[PDB]
Amino acid sequence: DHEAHIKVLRGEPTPEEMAALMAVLASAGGGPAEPVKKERNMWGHPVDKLRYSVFSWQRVTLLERTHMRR
């Protein structure tokens, strides 16, 4: 067991106060956890709009890396 739990550091609520608290906190939860449906779409990415010198090293370290990083 290595999840970080909610801790009541001070105070001792009754079961009904604990239930009210946890229901409120869960309603205040951040919604869906993360946007797992996010999809890669590199069309018109800003790095493709830059002018690069034909001998520019940023062709390797900026342009190519941005296209290839996954």
Partner 1 sequence: SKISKVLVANRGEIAVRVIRAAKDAGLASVAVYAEPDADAPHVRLADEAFALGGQTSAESYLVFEKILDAAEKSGANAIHPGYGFLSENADFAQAVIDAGLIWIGPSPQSIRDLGDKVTARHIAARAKAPLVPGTPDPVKDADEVVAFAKEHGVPVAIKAAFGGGGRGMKVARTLEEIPELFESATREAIAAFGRGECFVERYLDKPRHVEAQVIADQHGNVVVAGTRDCSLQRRFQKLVEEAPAPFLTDAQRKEIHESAKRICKEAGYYGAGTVEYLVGQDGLISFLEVNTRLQVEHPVTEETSGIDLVRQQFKIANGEPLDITEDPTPRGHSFEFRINGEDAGRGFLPAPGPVTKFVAPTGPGVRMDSGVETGSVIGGQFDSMLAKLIVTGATREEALERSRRALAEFTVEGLATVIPFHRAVVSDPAFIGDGEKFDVHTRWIETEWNNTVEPFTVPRQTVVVEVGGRRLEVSLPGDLAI
Partner 2 sequence: VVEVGGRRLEVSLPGDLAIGGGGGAAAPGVVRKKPKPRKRGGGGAKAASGDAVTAPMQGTVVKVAVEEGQEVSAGDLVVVLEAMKMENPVTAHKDGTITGLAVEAGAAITQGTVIAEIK
CA 4, 27, 36: angle at the middle one, nearest 5? 65
> Is the four-CA dihedral 62, 63, 64, 69 of positive or negative sign?
positive
Which of the listed partners (partner 1, partner 2, none) does 50 bind, with a CB threshold of 5 to 8 Å by partner kind?
Answer: none
At its nearest, how many Å lie between partner 1 and the CB of residue 50? 37
Query: Would you count residue 36 as binding partner 1 (CB under 8 A)?
Result: no
> Rounded distance, CA 45 to CA 50, Å?
10
Query: Would you count residue 33 as binding partner 2 (CB under 8 A)?
Result: yes
Query: Would you count residue 24 as binding partner 1 (CB under 8 A)?
Result: yes
Query: Would you count residue 15 as binding partner 2 (CB under 8 A)?
Result: no
